[model samples]
Target: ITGTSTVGVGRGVLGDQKNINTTYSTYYYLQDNTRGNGIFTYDAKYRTTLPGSLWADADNQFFASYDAPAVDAHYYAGVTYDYYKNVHNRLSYDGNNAAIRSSVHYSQGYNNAFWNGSQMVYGDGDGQTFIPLSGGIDVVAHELTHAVTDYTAGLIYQNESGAINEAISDIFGTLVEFYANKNPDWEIGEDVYTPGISGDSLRSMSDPAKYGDPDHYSKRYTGTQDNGGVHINSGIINKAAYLISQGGTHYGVSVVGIGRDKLGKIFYRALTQYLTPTSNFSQLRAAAVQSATDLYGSTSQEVASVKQAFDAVGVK
Candidate 1:
């Protein structure tokens, strides 16, 4: 729908008032046409549906209790877009100026968010467990990164490749958190997860084992549940990523920390240039090594550090 550009202010699920990009005609709508292609948000209205109607507001402002989720979803999506464009030089999730779309309030008492191979879908959460998931920037970035992985690595959703997929999402999600500098941490979903309970997160990168996830390959789950433990085994890779950014010792192996931005550059280069849908842990290690070599040189300490971090996680 052709409409004039406008900005809307609203109180989000976290009870914070923020400005959101919107379009206006008869009503203010959650469509930001300022970025690559475009950024759009829709209201799912407590149902399991795909790309529900574009969110429409009568006033230029939002924040009626019901508008909370849409407001946050639209705003966070814009921030995620900015992160990809400004930080990585990526156009959109596809890196070709593809329009980014999202739906919020996916289902009643739901408690999650995901990318359905195309657009983003967010749940309102059961309140006891979470509020609207869009309230979390890390969660938004996490889901958007999945689209990036699909467009680049095309990592299949099972076993080692699947674990790598999940890890990549969490890794960049944490980076974007620090990039935005809004209550930054190396934990995933902490902002909107278990609000009633403090100081705990859905997953931890610095110490995956803190939440019963395997930080070492030896403890990886072999079960079929959770898509061959995609979420569980991801801890191994997440630990390695953390060690790469902020070096530490694991299993008597040590690595020199290379810091965060360089680590991201290495992995992004690997994902775009190497890595296939069926790539396994060994392939991932090789790809990362080559990527670091390309950026920092084959015999450089950066390459050695990548190898050490993978070995520390037993990813050989």
Candidate 2:
């Protein structure tokens, strides 16, 4: 796929027009070589196929109805690449400027997106429950953080470790949302989730309990469902992260907010240096405390808030 790097004008899934990176040989393709090895996006064509076809346009302008998903996938991939590179000082998900690939239109009326161990995949929703997931920046960054987690901590995808993994994604996803400043909030996927219901989202870090997700560790689910409730129990860590970024009092415990940049510094340090594959919630508390201490000092309010945030969430 060696080709000349070019720029493209396009409209995203949400009907917002923005320029995107592209490549042109004969047919213009949605690929950018500037970020890492490259940022490549493919069209799945509503069929269950692996990287169905390279999204190509006759001209440098992408404005067709069918091109909606491709526009967002291509542009947001670049945005995420910039997030990791600029905010984290990491080249890419692997911290090595690896090529970032994404496939859109994964299935008929699909309603989810994921990182498939190697690359990102998006599903066009059924139009009632959700829309094209890439339309939401938080969702895009959330999936990309999974790749980051795999490359760094490699948290096991079950039990407490799995919840830690999910919460890490949620944490960075929220940060990137605010980083982009696109009507950012503490909610996840509100931009493209359940359009029928206003002021709702797939999850809420501000108050996981608002959606019946446990904001306290005492309410954690310990059953053999959802890989030991990875998604469900993640509420505990998400709440802690929320408390760190924005001060809160819950269950008679309080945390003084340390703000977002410090939050990112602490969590990223913990993920890259302190966590292991099988680290659990309690271990995560220790890692985060040490991370804050490393960056701000053991006696700093930053470190103290990190502890109180976890304690507020009942992480012990």
Candidate 3:
């Protein structure tokens, strides 16, 4: 919807206040015209239908309890957009400045969020398990990064390729969290995973095994569930990525930290240039090594760290 670009004050799901870019036309709508194309948010209204209604506000100030999820969804989408544009030089998830869209309050007692190929959908979790998922910047970034992966790598959503797909989302999700500098950590969905629990997350990149996820390739899940363990096996690659940025040792294999920026550069290059739909773990190893070599040369410590990170995760 075309309208005068405006800004609105709102308290998010976590009770944190932030200003959101909105559009004013009769009612304030959660449509931000500031970013490339635009960032639009919608209300699912506890139904399964998508992009249900462009979120509308009567006063242009979102302070109602019900407005929490929408505020965070809209605000975090903008943050994710900024991360990609400013850090990676990418316009949007599609690299074409495609309008980023999201819908919150998807279903009653829903406990998860996802990218439904075209747009993002957030679930208002059953409270005991999770709060509104969009509250977590990493969760928002993780879902948006799926859109990025779909456009670039198009990695198959099964087996090794699927794990790579999941890991890519996790990697960039963490990066986006750090980029936003909002209580950054290597944990995924920590901010909204369990409202009652003090310190736990849906997944952990720093220590995947903290939640029973494999931190090494040899320990990867071989089950047929979760798209052939896409979420489960992603730990292997996630650990490698974590090690690449924040060096660690696993199974006696050591990696020197090359920092997050280099890790992002190498992985982004591999995702955009080297990876194919069916690329497996071994292929991902080669891609990352080549990517690091391209960015920092074959003999650079960046390249060595990439190799060691893969080896530390038993990706060889």
Candidate 4:
């Protein structure tokens, strides 16, 4: 005979297998805590489920082989959620009551990761040089940020529009990493794939010249190599933003700092509030400078530094 289940227990018979479960619960015995809002109670529990031998591997790469993708996706998703909420005061990906869904390990030996309109997808690397693409938090954030850009600016994804699209993703992706304090460097995709591979980073922030790429835009720069130069020309805007935030020089020249947090907030506001699909680099520079003036007075150093950074990046 089988008995009914209760609380955290279940019963079955015949070919069914009954596994004993152990749970740990913590009780808060605080008295008269007036912090937060109205003594709200929150409960959290951590569980570890061992997989069956069928999926187990002898190499001890079990997480990467089976569950690491999901774990990494969830972890990065939470990081992005907290960043939007705390930094931008955004509710979620859509700034509405919307949920973001992430799918990891999309295909066998897939080389790239991308966002397909609604959800984010990642690829498991070839394992020879690269691990799983979702292993990097910034990559996960970068894909999701593309969705945010689509929802906000709806950039056309060609020429200036395409550059803006890529630039916005790079900006937010870097901000997400900075907010998480993951790594203080400007290299992207440094954690996902093993080192010693060329073209590993889709873009560079600190020193765009390190790639031996051109500083200015040209017809030759925009080719099939980087998807209409969306990724290549993005260096202009990326360096512009990084220079403004880091308060440094371009190509060994010295410039004033714009205060990283202030610059980030200004760009966020400009991208989400002021900019449009038809905005070019020139227009973007003007909008950002105007945003700074509106937020922090016209005579403020923040506004001046913004203009200087734009000028340094040849945005005139």
Candidate 5:
């Protein structure tokens, strides 16, 4: 019901702590938190509280084992806000001063978090296995990105549309993690789980094959689990984005090119600036290549690298 949390100074409720005076620094925090928690305040009563009783109502139930949700929600909201404005030069979720809201502790031991039409919702994980979802930046960004997708392409949550939806989220989710400049590792949901399970993050953008379950977006991947395999197949997009940026062999395919950040900017430009709701892999590829060409010239090495990265993914 609720979204996951990300760890960082001044993320959710702590956003005010960040010093937003410079461009790059300001963009980093803004991309992570749009509302500017430290700079702005909201009426606590206006927002929904963690439901007091799980049996009272499915929507009203608010489990209280984890740290305060308002704090974490505030932090991530600010982060998401800052991310959009800083990276893409966008205004807000709706590109017009939209105030971000979030709900925490939605269900009893709920394992997943999501973003509804307007706000982000988070759940406390099953304590025995996963911790509260509100403990990771990528997961927080992941849910907020759903709102971004909804506003932009409004990608249908089925088939390739669904996969693109998930992939775009993962793309920016990882970007938020890197924007935060956390540990260089490429793991998602690491903070949301207990330490007992080794390698328990939900997905790995750096190397999808590391999981070895073979359910990620390979040609042989199936579509039974994980919401028609949206979460699983998303790895293909995630891998494509990662490969284009990092420049390496993925899934036995040799990929060569620019830095990850450069590639990410191209995709961000294409998605936020050029592509439409019906955009597919081919469309995305073309848009990104065009973006690269526009930003740096067709003969630029960045453009060549972007094309090569697309080729590695069989995107042509």
Candidate 6:
């Protein structure tokens, strides 16, 4: 919509107040032009259709209960945009400043969220399972990172490649969370998952076994469900990533901690440069090692840790 750029105040799904970018052309629209290209948010209006309608406001004050998901979706998309731009020097998910778009309130008790190739869609979860998914910054970043993966690695979303794709999202999602400096942890979807429960998340990178996910390749699932257990098998890679940043000993293999910044650098390099559509876990190990060597050195501790982390996860 053609309009003057404006700022609006709103409360997110968690009732936290924040300012969102809006456009004023008769009605205040959640179309932020501040970021590269732009960040546009839409309302699905509890239907199964896509990017239903551009969210609009009468007063530019989004404190109404129905406005919570849109506020967070619009606000967090900007934050994720800033993360890639400032931290990684990437303009947007495409590295070309492609406009980021999102839709909230996707369906009645939808309980899930995903990147639909073109844009992001967030479900307003059933009260018992989840709340509004956009309320979770990691969730938003995780989904958006899928776009990044599609543009770069193009990892196939099945079997080992699918697991690698999933782990990449988890890795960058956690990195984006830390970049935002919010209640950072090695957990995924903690903010919007299971509102009735506390101290639990959808998955744990630090200890994937805590949730019955395989921390070692030896424990990997070999079933046909879940696209060859893409989400479940990602634990093998996720644990290795966690170990790369915060070193740990697993199955008698020890890794020296290389901290988070280097972790991001190495993985970003791997995703953008080395990984391919059919890359598997062993290939991922090689990519990370090469990535670390590219950023650090062939004999650097960062490279060694990358090797050790993969070995610790039985990826050899």
Candidate 5 is scored at a TM of 0.76
Predictions: Cα RMSD each:
1.0, 0.8, 0.7, 10.7, 8.3, 0.7
Name model 3 segments beyond 4 Å from true.
none
lDDT of 3 by residue, 152-184 (tens): 999999999999999999999999999999799
Model 6 Cα lDDT, one tens digit per residue, 2-85? 999999999999999999999999999999999998999999988978889999999999999999999999998999999889
Across 208-307, the per-residue lDDT of candidate 5 in tens digits comes to 6665422233352556666566666666667777877777875466767577578667877776777776666677778888999988899998887777
Go through the candidates in order and give each one's C-alpha lDDT.
Answer: 0.90, 0.91, 0.94, 0.62, 0.62, 0.94
Q: For each candidate, what TM-score against the reference? A: 0.98, 0.98, 0.99, 0.76, 0.76, 0.99
Clashing pairs in 1: none
Candidate 2's C-alpha runs over 4 A off are none
- Positional deviation of 209 in candidate 2, in angstroms? 0.7
lDDT of 1 at 150: 98
Q: What's the true lDDT of residue 69 in model 1?
A: 81
Winner on TM-score between 1 and 5 is 1
Model 2 has how many clashing residue pairs? 0
- Least well predicted 10-residue stretch by lDDT in candidate 4: 38-47
Question: lDDT, candidate 2, residue 64?
Answer: 85
